[PDB]
Amino acid sequence: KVFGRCELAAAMKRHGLDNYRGYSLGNWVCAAKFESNFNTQATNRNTDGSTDYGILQINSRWWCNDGRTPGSRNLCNIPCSALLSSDITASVNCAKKIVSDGNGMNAWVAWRNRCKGTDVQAWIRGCRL
């Protein structure tokens, strides 16, 4: 599924991500924009053999099982394919665990490099929420 910007904002709010761990909804929308361009089916292979999955590009090295990432963990206790669904629930629940792991949203390199410290409210501007 390719979400619209306000559509994704609304779904993220519906699943409790707005202001989760102190990160406003604009931060989460911005992260999704630059991680996946709002496409739930986005997958990207990393140099080390792991893969990033879904709207928030969650990595099989730690967070989900894809059966092809040797010596990795599955800390969200889900198949990585669950992070590709049109319903964002599994990606949101896993992202809640990731952003609680110690480094906040810095876990998302595109957030740090493209969203952090910018006017992230622009991502929700005009949305009926």
UniProtKB/Swiss-Prot annotation:
Role summary: Lysozymes have primarily a bacteriolytic function; those in tissues and body fluids are associated with the monocyte-macrophage system and enhance the activity of immunoagents. Has bacteriolytic activity against M.luteus.
Miscellaneous note of the record: Lysozyme C is capable of both hydrolysis and transglycosylation; it also shows a slight esterase activity. It acts rapidly on both peptide-substituted and unsubstituted peptidoglycan, and slowly on chitin oligosaccharides.
GO CC annotation, single: cytoplasm
- According to its UniProt entry, this protein's organism is Gallus gallus (Chicken)
Q: Which reaction does it catalyse?
A: Hydrolysis of (1->4)-beta-linkages between N-acetylmuramic acid and N-acetyl-D-glucosamine residues in a peptidoglycan and between N-acetyl-D-glucosamine residues in chitodextrins
Which residues take part in binding substrate? 101
Entry EC no(s) = 3.2.1.17
Family per record: Belongs to the glycosyl hydrolase 22 family.
What is the top EC class of this enzyme, as a single word? hydrolase
Query: Which residue range or ranges hold the C-type lysozyme domain?
Result: 1-129
Keywords per UniProt: Allergen, Antimicrobial, Bacteriolytic enzyme, Disulfide bond, Glycosidase, Hydrolase, Secreted, Signal
Q: Which GO terms describe its biological process?
A: cell wall macromolecule catabolic process; defense response to bacterium; defense response to Gram-negative bacterium; defense response to Gram-positive bacterium; killing of cells of another organism
Listed disulfide bonds for this chain? 6-127, 30-115, 64-80, 76-94
One MF term in GO for this entry? Answer: lysozyme activity
Cell compartments where the protein resides: Secreted
Keyword Signal, does the record have it? yes
Oligomeric and partner information: Monomer.
What is the reported tissue distribution? In the egg white and polymorphonuclear leukocytes.
Keyword Signal among record annotations: yes
In Pfam terms, one family for this protein is: Lys
The name this protein carries in UniProt is: Lysozyme C
Q: Where is the active site?
A: 35, 52
Question: Which superkingdom, per the lineage?
Answer: Eukaryota
